[PDB]
């Protein structure tokens, strides 16, 4: 069995030995005969290489060649060579990279997308960009549910529709869109907006609900308890005005719900609570959109890819756009919870 | 001891 | 002078008062008396009123509407009524209530000129943002082709479009989306220094190219001895990054803060690949719209002003490096 | 298996013989012959050696030299050559001393989570500890603003920082210590026991907040039900007070082993009570708060605090513990 | 004449009567109806009231007042009404209870620490927490003595520095962090490290010297005959692996010095090579303790209002048990160092 | 506690 060194991994003379890595996999190693060693070990993996192969190879110790094979393995510096065929005139090229990167055999994760089934619901700037990126990473199928049509002040936000858009129904112009992107996937759309707390048995089962649509006020508390009931997995994305919002991402019988982390009378202003929360229009902004719906589906594909953890496992998360901000809310599961207790 | 804790 | 009530404001009875707002500015009102009478004071202001008209159509004793009416103000929960009125409608609503006039927010996009150097992923996503937000020229910089692995994170890119310039692709997506601005193509990817005099002044310039691997070096000096505002904006792997936003004069640049060995690291560095991940592309290209939208409208202050700032994506984790300016730097100064 | 003499051993005539070790492990060796044959023994493994070629290079019996051997071995005074490979290197010695691997404890830390429940005194020390062991992730909570009277003893906190909240100041100033590691805030205090569930799961939560008065019977309460570690910290005025640590199916809880005009006098009196706060009691608490937290998720030896309420008092030579065993009646849990 | 009820008094319901005070002082009173009498008793020092007017509205025969009054009073439950007449907004407050309790005026505590000097002699992990606590308690003068530089390793014990003062000198760095924390006081470096016993004489007269400078071995016994000879009052604070040591804090003419109790060639080589390896296994929390208790110490020593711990005695505070043991360092007369 | 304080 061959291994081969990573593309993703560079290397620099830093402090006293060297980085090896990039992003979040950056390892800093002090020792400056360790990094040396570490080196040329890797050095020994640029073709695919079985251990041995690649040590017949090198001008170091045995047992040195062992410790630093065993850092490069364990990081996922060097990968199993089988790991390493796309087609390179494949698509997801550059998506395999990041698969390798956290261990995955990339082709696994790719077929994992390939029959995987998402439900958009709400198909607005958060709706919009989500279904962009699944459809580009290769989600198979992909349902589009809205009722709603397409406005002139919705451009600003809304990346798939142009100009010409305008009064086309979301659903028929993300479709078109997506199927411009990528020819390979099947992409449907039901004409529906969730009213009734019964509309949710019309929403088809999938791999996982991408929930964005804000209204109803309260829309996910619907979704919430039909999903728990339903056992369906769903991501909830969307903005407060200037923060962007992810999470939590339901996963039946692992997370904790929307419910779990939850425990005017005067009528004259009462009536004006109302009138001012009816005229209620989000001040919202591209870049916070966008942001919102990128996380979301990350969170989406490590779902569905299973290579690494969703970072909205347990979470509400906010990011803030005016500062360098993120906070989370709690939303673990409660053994006393009201709608996913079952026990 | 004891009393109970402040904070 | 008449005051209205934001259309971005939402109020909820919470804990032992309410909330007033939402996002970054939501305030949390201890007291009930105060919270019912904050919320008397704003009813009045639903369609524009002088505070005399509202202290006389809200029931409530002077002291208690002028305090409930400077809360209102400061929060820029209330504007100038002249401040209301659109494409842009729902970008108006973000300035209002940073206390901006929108109109003269948009008049800076609409005269502005940015350029965007380097039209990959991360130049796609902020090229779209700021087409879609007004921002009057874009001029769009790159020499390269479309490619079938390139659809993964250029979300203006067709799979009719692999072969075709990128440049060219993203000027017709852009002018679809904003018909009322203009865009240039320039055929030019920076392989000397000298190539930078090519690329023409700006309010600013957005870097997002990765070729070759020296380039915000050069990018720097150039725009910091032609008084050039910048900002730069990538990724190293899973990590998103945006910033510094260098300002002439004003905040600091981006240098303030064995043999066999050798070429075997020279090497293994040749054959690099990043670990590309469109989710981190556009975080990292969204939050560079923004401060470039911030910088230029004037409205709030840019995030990466003096800053290098990192999103992370396996974790839930932002970070900024410090990079405000020395007064021994190599580079300014 | 190479085996090699911990940096932390010294040695010293005394008495009849002489002493091993330094610290708790110290020991006295009566017999002078047999104190000389650990030395002699001790002294092959100064630099990483196997047990036969030691054996070779002393000049002792066979039979003394295991002896010798096992009583170094046994006493973590000798350890394997591996557990020998930093900035957490003095913590290493730790480890080390108690026969652990260094790495293996300093790979648990960096995998943990820990709530910091309070932001005060006994936070700010508990937490850069915490922090600068390398304890992967902490999460602090707290809703308070930083004013100049806290200065006495939230390290962490300068007079620049008056004003801000207590939770973003922490952050920047674990940060600042250990960039490596991932902080949260969390902006709440516990003024209803319902704000607990807005707390997250952790390996340990550290509790500390002086109010309200019975924050720990509902964070008992709260963990016992959701099986949440938990460790108390604090003060009765002059005496620093640590434990229990709880852990669930495995110790007893905070509660298992414990007129008309009086009982309204005694609220009143007891209503206007204020700690006499002092730093040195405050940091004693801390520190063996965060010792006890650093070995329960290290696993290297036993809390201190298991089953255990301990008093250290700051005006007489004196430390006290109260038993807090489990109890089948107990009103929270059995 | 005035007498005000301690905030920090607490009174509980317990066993057959109940408890009075939180902390050393609490005392267990087994006699119900006593009990209740020192109750109506306390709660009439609430507001700050004479003897005569708080027995005034007292419900209860003026023998059992006046022997719950005495009881309160010598615990110091109840204080003067004058002690407490600071601003509960004045920055060195939150200690002024603590001063209360035990029957000092905060006031006049407050300014001997004020009117204090203390060389701090070793700016390594004890230096770091013993200065800040002495800063933020108001010691009016501190003069920091270390000629070591920052490293990567130091940061877990030494508080206050941060990744960014690596390179840079402890002396200079803790200077910066104190005057951030207090920038009422003075602070004072002297950039140097006790190589020879003929380098002490560099170090300055103070209220007191906190000695945790971490080379040479003898450092103490060098330190010990300088301050006998200097009359220098000292303390001593550190550890022993995993044991937390501080003490003995030696006054002149008053306590025993630290040489006061003290008790083959090639045996001696390994001995002597076995010794030059040692590193200490340091651990923030033994550190921390050491630090604290060495700190309050310092305190009382200069502030006068409650005996410090380790006069006559080394005190060892154990960490993986419960364990606290004072060592003897009473005066000899028969003492090398200091006696005949 | 028998031997000398490291610092
Ligand atoms: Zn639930
Ligand atoms: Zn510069
Ligand atoms: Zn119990
Ligand atoms: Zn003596």
Same mark, same amino acid.
């Given at each position: 069995?061959?291994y081969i060194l990573g593309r993703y991994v560079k290397i620099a003379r830093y402090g006293s030995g060297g980085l090896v890595g990039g992003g979040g996999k950056e390892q800093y190693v002090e020792n400056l005969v360790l990094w040396e060693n570490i080196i040329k070990t890797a050095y020994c993996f640029i073709?695919?290489?079985?251990?041995?192969?690649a040590?017949?190879?090198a001008?170091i110790?045995?047992?040195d060649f062992s410790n630093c094979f065993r850092f490069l393995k364990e990081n996922f510096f060097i990968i199993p060579g089988?790991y390493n065929?796309?087609?390179?005139?494949?698509?997801?090229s550059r998506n395999f990279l990041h698969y390798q990167s956290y261990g995955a055999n990339p082709?696994?994760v790719?077929?994992?997308?390939?029959?995987?089934?998402?439900?958009?619901?709400?198909?607005?700037?958060?709706?919009?960009?989500?279904?962009?990126?699944?459809?580009?990473?290769?989600?198979?199928?992909?349902?589009?549910?809205?009722?709603?049509?397409?406005?002139?002040?919705?451009?600003?936000?809304?990346?798939?529709?142009?100009?010409?858009?305008?009064?086309?129904?979301?659903?028929?112009? *993300?479709?078109?869109?997506?199927?411009?992107?990528?020819?390979?996937?099947?992409?449907?759309?039901?004409?529906?907006?969730?009213?009734?707390?019964?509309?949710?048995?019309?929403?088809?089962?999938?791999?996982?609900?991408?929930?964005?649509?804000?209204?109803?006020?309260?829309?996910?508390?619907? @979704?919430?308890?039909?999903?728990?009931?339903?056992?369906?997995?769903?991501?909830?994305?969307?903005?407060?005005?200037?923060?962007?919002?992810?999470?939590?991402?339901?996963?039946?019988?692992?997370?904790?719900?929307?419910?779990?982390?939850? @425990?005017?009378?005067?009528?004259?202003?009462?009536?004006?609570?109302?009138? *001012?929360?009816?005229?209620?229009?989000?001040?919202?902004?591209?870049?916070?959109?966008?942001v919102?719906?990128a996380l979301?589906?990350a969170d989406?594909i490590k779902?569905?890819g299973k290579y690494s953890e969703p970072l909205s496992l347990?979470?509400?998360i906010?990011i803030?756009?005016?500062?360098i901000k993120i906070?989370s809310?709690?939303?673990?599961?409660?053994?006393?919870?009201?709608?996913?207790?079952?026990? | 001891?004891?009393?109970?804790?402040?904070?």
């Amino acid at each position: 069995m061959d291994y081969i060194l990573g593309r993703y991994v560079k290397i620099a003379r830093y402090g006293s030995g060297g980085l090896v890595g990039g992003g979040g996999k950056e390892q800093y190693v002090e020792n400056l005969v360790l990094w040396e060693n570490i080196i040329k070990t890797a050095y020994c993996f640029i073709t695919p290489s079985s251990y041995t192969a690649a040590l017949e190879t090198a001008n170091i110790p045995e047992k040195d060649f062992s410790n630093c094979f065993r850092f490069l393995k364990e990081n996922f510096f060097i990968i199993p060579g089988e790991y390493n065929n796309s087609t390179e005139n494949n698509r997801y090229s550059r998506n395999f990279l990041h698969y390798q990167s956290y261990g995955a055999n990339p082709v696994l994760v790719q077929d994992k997308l390939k029959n995987a089934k998402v439900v958009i619901l709400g198909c607005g700037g958060i709706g919009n960009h989500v279904s962009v990126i699944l459809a580009t990473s290769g989600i198979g199928e992909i349902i589009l549910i809205d009722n709603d049509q397409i406005e002139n002040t919705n451009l600003t936000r809304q990346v798939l529709f142009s100009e010409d858009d305008v009064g086309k129904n979301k659903t028929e112009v *993300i479709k078109r869109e997506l199927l411009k992107r990528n020819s390979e996937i099947s992409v449907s759309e039901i004409a529906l907006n969730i009213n009734d707390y019964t509309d949710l048995h019309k929403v088809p089962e999938a791999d996982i609900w991408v929930v964005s649509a804000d209204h109803p006020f309260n829309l996910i508390n619907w @979704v919430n308890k039909y999903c728990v009931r339903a056992n369906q997995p769903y991501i909830n994305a969307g903005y407060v005005n200037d923060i962007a919002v992810f999470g939590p991402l339901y996963v039946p019988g692992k997370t904790g719900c929307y419910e779990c982390q939850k @425990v005017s009378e005067k009528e004259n202003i009462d009536h004006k609570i109302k009138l *001012i929360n009816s005229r209620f229009k989000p001040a919202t902004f591209a870049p916070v959109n966008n942001v919102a719906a990128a996380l979301c589906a990350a969170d989406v594909i490590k779902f569905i890819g299973k290579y690494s953890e969703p970072l909205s496992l347990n979470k509400r998360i906010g990011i803030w756009s005016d500062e360098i901000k993120i906070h989370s809310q709690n939303m673990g599961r409660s053994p006393v919870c009201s709608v996913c207790g079952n026990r | 001891m004891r009393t109970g804790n402040a904070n």
